[PDB]
């Protein structure tokens, strides 16, 4: 029991968000991609497209988007060109501005919205973590719980 | 991640805001943030 104790006193798990924040913050790329080569690392373009496009997004918008973000030089345009994509595709799915003449409101399937989900409270964190906010990173870990 | 290498990222919070809300004008054309804000719940949380 002693040893247990200990253990329930360090396990990652029971410990605060203000630490798991401050080692993911901690840890850095290169010390994770040095030694391997530039093969193993799948292009994040292509994958990024084609899961917008698996999300049901405009084939031409979105390829756009990822060119401008392959493009564009600076970490700052490039998060917020990511939240860029992440608000048009809570508006194309969940259309907003539109102001919905019709009175019938089908939602979508449970996965797609499981997808949705995740795909913001994910970035939200990474932004928060960026910016190291702990209510918020508790809250989004509350959310995921 | 593999796009942004780098994370303890620093800057303005203002910057971020300007920014997103130029691109947006750009791409999309008909959103913006004052029709999000208690709307949508995305950006309740960060301070953007």
């Known amino acids: ?145 | 991640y593999k796009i942004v290498k780098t994370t303890r990222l620093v800057g303005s919070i203002k910057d971020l805001s300007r920014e997103v809300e130029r691109h947006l004008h750009r791409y999309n054309r008909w959103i913006t943030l004052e029709d999000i804000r208690s709307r949508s719940s995305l950006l309740d949380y960060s301070c953007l």
């Not at chain 1, 901690?26 to 373009?45: K, T």
């Open chain 1, 1 to 145: 029991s002693s040893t247990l104790r200990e253990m329930s006193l360090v396990l990652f798990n029971c410990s605060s968000p203000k630490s798991e924040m401050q080692r993911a913050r901690s840890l850095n790329y290169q010390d994770l991609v040095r030694g391997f080569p530039e093969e193993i690392i799948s292009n994040p373009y292509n994958e990024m497209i084609i899961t917008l496009i698996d999300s049901d997004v405009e084939s031409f918008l979105v390829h756009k988007m990822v060119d401008d973000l392959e493009l564009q030089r600076g970490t700052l345009s490039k998060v917020a060109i990511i939240i860029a994509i992440m608000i048009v595709f809570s508006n194309r799915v969940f259309n907003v501005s539109k102001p919905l003449t019709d009175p019938s409101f089908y939602p979508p399937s449970d996965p797609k919205i499981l997808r949705h989900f995740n795909i913001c409270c994910s970035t939200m964190m990474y932004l928060s973590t960026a910016l190291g906010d702990v209510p918020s990173f508790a809250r989004l870990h509350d959310l995921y719980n």
